[PDB]
Design a protein around this ligand. Sequence first.
Ligand SMILES: [Mg+2]
Ligand SMILES: [Mg+2]
Ligand SMILES: [Mg+2]
Ligand SMILES: [Mg+2]
Ligand SMILES: [Mg+2]
Ligand SMILES: [Mg+2]
Ligand SMILES: [Mg+2]
Ligand SMILES: [Mg+2]
Ligand SMILES: [Mg+2]
Ligand SMILES: [Mg+2]
Ligand SMILES: [Mg+2]
Ligand SMILES: [Mg+2]
Ligand SMILES: [Mg+2]
Ligand SMILES: [Mg+2]
Ligand SMILES: [Mg+2]
Ligand SMILES: [Mg+2]
Ligand SMILES: [Mg+2]
Ligand SMILES: [Mg+2]
Ligand SMILES: [Mg+2]
Ligand SMILES: [Mg+2]
Ligand SMILES: [Mg+2]
Ligand SMILES: [Mg+2]
Ligand SMILES: [Mg+2]
Ligand SMILES: [Mg+2]
Ligand SMILES: [Mg+2]
Ligand SMILES: [Mg+2]
Ligand SMILES: [Mg+2]
Ligand SMILES: [Mg+2]
Ligand SMILES: [Mg+2]
Ligand SMILES: [Mg+2]
Ligand SMILES: [Mg+2]
Ligand SMILES: [Mg+2]
Ligand SMILES: [Zn+2]
Lengths: 98, 91, 169, 200
Amino acid sequence: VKRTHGYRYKSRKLLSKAPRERGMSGLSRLLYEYKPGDKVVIDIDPTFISTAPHRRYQGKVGVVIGTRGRAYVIETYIGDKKKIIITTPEHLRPHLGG
Amino acid sequence: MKFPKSVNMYCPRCNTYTQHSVSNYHGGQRRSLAEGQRRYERKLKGYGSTPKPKQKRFAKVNKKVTLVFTCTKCGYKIVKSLGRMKKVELV
Amino acid sequence: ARPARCYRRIKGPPYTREEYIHGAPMIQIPKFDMGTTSAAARAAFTMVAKLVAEERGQIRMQALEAARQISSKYLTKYVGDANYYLRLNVVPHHVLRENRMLAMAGADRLQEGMRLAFGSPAGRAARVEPGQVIFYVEFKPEHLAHVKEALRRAASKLPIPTRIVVEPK
Amino acid sequence: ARGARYKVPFRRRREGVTNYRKRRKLLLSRKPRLVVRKTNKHLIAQIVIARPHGDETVVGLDTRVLSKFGWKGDENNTSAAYLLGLIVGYKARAKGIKEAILDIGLHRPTPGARVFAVMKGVIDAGVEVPHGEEVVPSEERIRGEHVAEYAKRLKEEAPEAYKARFSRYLQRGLPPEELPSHFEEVKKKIVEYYEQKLAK
RNA sequence: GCCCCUAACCCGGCCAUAGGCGCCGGUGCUACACCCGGUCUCAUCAGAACCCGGAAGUUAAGGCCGGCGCCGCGCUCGGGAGUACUGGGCUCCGCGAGGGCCCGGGAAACCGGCGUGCUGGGAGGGGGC
RNA sequence: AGUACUGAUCGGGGCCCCGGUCAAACUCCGAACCUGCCAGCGCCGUAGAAGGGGGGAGGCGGGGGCGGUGGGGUAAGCCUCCGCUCCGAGACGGGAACAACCGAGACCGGGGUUAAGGCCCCCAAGUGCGGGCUUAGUGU
RNA sequence: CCCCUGAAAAGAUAUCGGGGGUGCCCAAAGCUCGGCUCAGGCGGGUCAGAAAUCCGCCGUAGAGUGUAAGGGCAAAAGCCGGGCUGACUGGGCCCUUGAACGCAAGGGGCCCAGGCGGGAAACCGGGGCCUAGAGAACGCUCGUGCCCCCACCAGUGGGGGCCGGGCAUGACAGAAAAGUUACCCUAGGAAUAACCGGCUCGUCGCGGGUGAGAGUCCCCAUCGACCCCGCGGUUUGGUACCCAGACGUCGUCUCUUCCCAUCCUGGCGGUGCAGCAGCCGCCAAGGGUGGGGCUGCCCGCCCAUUAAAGGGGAACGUGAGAUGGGU
Ligand SMILES: [Mg+2]
Ligand SMILES: [Mg+2]
Ligand SMILES: [Mg+2]
Ligand SMILES: [Mg+2]
Ligand SMILES: [Mg+2]
Ligand SMILES: [Mg+2]
Ligand SMILES: [Mg+2]
Ligand SMILES: [Mg+2]
Ligand SMILES: [Mg+2]
Ligand SMILES: [Mg+2]
Ligand SMILES: [Mg+2]
Ligand SMILES: [Mg+2]
Ligand SMILES: [Mg+2]
Ligand SMILES: [Mg+2]
Ligand SMILES: [Mg+2]
Ligand SMILES: [Mg+2]
Ligand SMILES: [Mg+2]
Ligand SMILES: [Mg+2]
Ligand SMILES: [Mg+2]
Ligand SMILES: [Mg+2]
Ligand SMILES: [Mg+2]
Ligand SMILES: [Mg+2]
Ligand SMILES: [Mg+2]
Ligand SMILES: [Mg+2]
Ligand SMILES: [Mg+2]
Ligand SMILES: [Mg+2]
Ligand SMILES: [Mg+2]
Ligand SMILES: [Mg+2]
Ligand SMILES: [Mg+2]
Ligand SMILES: [Mg+2]
Ligand SMILES: [Mg+2]
Ligand SMILES: [Mg+2]
Ligand SMILES: [Zn+2]
């Protein structure tokens, strides 16, 4: 049968967690104030999956464009198309490679 | 599923939350003076085959549950759909 | 049954999850350890003989059973059960499938040819690697000739080439 | 504990001091937190800014600071809570904080509690802290009239029980029946001190 | 005010080197506690708890610090092992499934060794400005 | 790789401990490898990168070799996916013929040198050189 | 449509591939605040018990979380209690369906304004912890607006319009729809079957290894359980490469040739070979292998003989040679 495409349709390994990673995660990712121009990494947190971006954006580097209430607007690229990911800080990490 | 016969709900005309009575939606009777009905009777007059399609195969098992909320203060009516399921019981 | 050459070659992933396999056959091998199995009495035995695979392939459960009977019968007749320990080291976890039109086995088995070609279960096999130890014998050094003969007779019933390796415990 | 699959909780959770659900909700505010903590002897008031590598405490004080202004009441009654809140609010206003969110931790938010007394003192010092109108204790309890009434009844009824139950007040030189007036003098001292400091 | 140094207390970060079991100690002016009561705020079947008011008692317990053994855990440590596996090339072997050579990468289990919280801010205390 | 979660599975010893066999729909660990951003190298680019607009399409039947034990199948010059390359749409040398195997990319004419492969004759180039094995015309 | 696997550690990924589910259900199974801790085990306790309520110790989740599968969850996302209806009104942007790369509906996320609920506050609430339960045009109906229009002007009744909800197409990017043809006709197709041919050999025929067991004893004179390795292309099947402007479809007759895995004839050996006979193996294809009864047959069975009355290939040899019983 042709592949079904739910919003989380091949995400077993990506949303699984190791036994040492179980439960709540630390709150330090909430406390990063990203300014426009900052570089972030999209690293999905499985405990907050309802606000997480799609699996195709995991491990991608984006640029903060603005803030919308409590989320951040991130301009990234999927191959060659420009995509906008609006996500909260718990799925983001600061990019240290410049 | 059971739904109350009265709810507290925002009223756009009152611009505040008021008590709304709850009833089932009932479609009105088709009036013969409607433009589409007039065109249909015109098409029905004369010789020929049956002039319009008529569905034979139906697939839905339930209709979308439609309810009318009437503001008790001003009589404003809000018709909403609760989704496709069996008929609700007003309680 | 089909010839064993039909299932000798490893051609796909292992098929072992019995909670997903419908109508998986039972393992017909009745016992796997022969002779004096208690380690307190195995302390007497000092020689280890090993029938070891030479190629990679699949051995059917019936082939493993036939080798087991021939070796165990020889060892009982000529060494006695108190003087050896014999273990069939592999278990037939893999489930074999065959595509054939047949009796009441599903409505998709009544369509002929390669349409709906995923076969039904047909038997069990043990997937083995080169150098894998198929048969393990512990014995006293005086019975070396009889143990080698039993291993040769067991090897005659298997679908892949093997060899006998003798060493001390 | 036993086996690799056991997940040890957070250190502060297993020591029993941080509710991380409530802490996450507080951290969503992005405002400074007025942390109020109770001990058996003192009250701790802090203005904290949370940072990714560790919280930063702008101002922190327990009720030992009231001795600098000459407090002779108990260390952690409602009046002491109010005075501590006043001092912490004035210090925070000096250091530039104008708004804060109350953080009571594992304590219960019962109305008229000492945490709300501290919050009322902070509000009166000039720092805005959001709150309901029904949780701050009455002005009588803030002045300490409940302590005075209890001391008066105890002195009338069981004088030896009065001496036993308020020995430290008598050692300090303030009978518990004179608590409201002394609270008024100390509050006047603190207000005058920090208002002159703010003017200068 | 400000700088430096520093226990137990408060707010944290990473979230077992931090956990678990057992044994042996230290700590008590202050701080943290156990503790003493229920008039008031508040609370329940229950002042146990929560909440309030205290200070007679005690370091017995908690907390914090030091030592030992075990379990678990961690490590860019030695072995396992350049092994398993693998990116590229081949008129190289094998009947064949497969294997081999060259260039480039390179584990894991397990065994032994070592380690068994580290750290940011504040209060308090000490020394200067 | 492991058998620690979910399952199977053979023995020993006292529900646990020890050894042993497995997992497409198991996972503490975990490469090669692929991939995102930045800096550099390399190369391309002002004789014009990125980006955009307009006209006209063909085509929307593919195939071969090699690799994913790819998944299926007894197997198939079999069915269905993934990647490089070649045929289709590519001359030419070798392979005894032979689209896709090896070499190699052809404007025309000539000279030379090499690639694959070959050098007893057919057939250009060796009845070339050292050691060893085969007696089956095995084999070439 | 949705989940896991296939899927080869970015993305994408198919088969009448494997394991399953969906067309709902719930006024609480939705929102929020607080308290608590589950399965299970152990000790004590009136009726009381394996299991009721009670006191305590252990208990990493071994429970529960509506519903598939996967994932998540312990001062909670579970259980109980309090208060509620945000399953809200008007709008915007983004993600996915739909990869890079055009493209419905549906679904999810982030917000602004209005007005609320819970809460001390922070904060959350635009249904269900997350990934499924989903429907264009035309027509009709309902809600809404001091709303717009209806032909020279005004009025009355009536009609239409913009915005939003519903009534449905499940073949779910949306015709309203039963057979039969052997009486058949057309346009094409080796993109696609039937015969032969090709590939493959499961099946079929044949050969070998092994030796439990039988053979009075004795594995191997003669067999050969349980298994395993092969060969042929002699049946059947698989596939669909060639051939639809056409290769005449079974059997028989007639005639020639080839193979050997040999039925007799030549040679040899073993024997459980006394003789007569029989059985088994090897070389060997020069010759022979016939006449009848039964069925269209091939095959098969039978009759009387005989040294014996072998089996196969040749476009299932041979219909521009016949025959025409069968199909
Ligand atoms: Mg698709
Ligand atoms: Mg949701
Ligand atoms: Mg395969
Ligand atoms: Mg293994
Ligand atoms: Mg990959
Ligand atoms: Mg196509
Ligand atoms: Mg290809
Ligand atoms: Mg050639
Ligand atoms: Mg020549
Ligand atoms: Mg992928
Ligand atoms: Mg659901
Ligand atoms: Mg809750
Ligand atoms: Mg689509
Ligand atoms: Mg696209
Ligand atoms: Mg959908
Ligand atoms: Mg006119
Ligand atoms: Mg369609
Ligand atoms: Mg064809
Ligand atoms: Mg055919
Ligand atoms: Mg023909
Ligand atoms: Mg056969
Ligand atoms: Mg034999
Ligand atoms: Mg055939
Ligand atoms: Mg042809
Ligand atoms: Mg023709
Ligand atoms: Mg012809
Ligand atoms: Mg013709
Ligand atoms: Mg012969
Ligand atoms: Mg013919
Ligand atoms: Mg003819
Ligand atoms: Mg002819
Ligand atoms: Mg006829
Ligand atoms: Zn109204």
